Design a protein around this nucleic acid. Structure first.
Length: 48
RNA sequence: GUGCUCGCUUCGGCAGCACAUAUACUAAAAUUGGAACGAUACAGAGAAGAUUAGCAUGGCCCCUGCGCAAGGAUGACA
């Protein structure tokens, strides 16, 4: 959802890969699930 | 149409007479076609040589070896 040169609030479909870098840090379902993997191996040192 | 004829003829009318003499792309309407360098989309270094590494050839000067041609000076008793 962009604006044109005159600011007309249009919707465009672009293909130039220049603002496409995904962030995906510390708050994603995929990243969170990958962190949850091997969580069973983290239950050894039970600090009571 | 206006006005007039000593006309027919009546004021209800008629016949003739003078003037009027040739506008308009004419158009209100009919329809189906072909259409940007305007936007968004892409690209965007939108002005450079379009290169530098060796060796061999070619020119000049020596040195050495071999060949060809023509030569110079010298050496050897029993």
């Amino acid at each position: 959802r962009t604006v044109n040169k005159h600011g007309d609030e249009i919707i465009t479909s672009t293909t130039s890969n220049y603002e496409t870098q995904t962030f995906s840090s510390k708050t994603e379902w995929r990243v969170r699930a990958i962190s949850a993997a091997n969580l069973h191996l983290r239950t050894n040192h039970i600090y009571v």
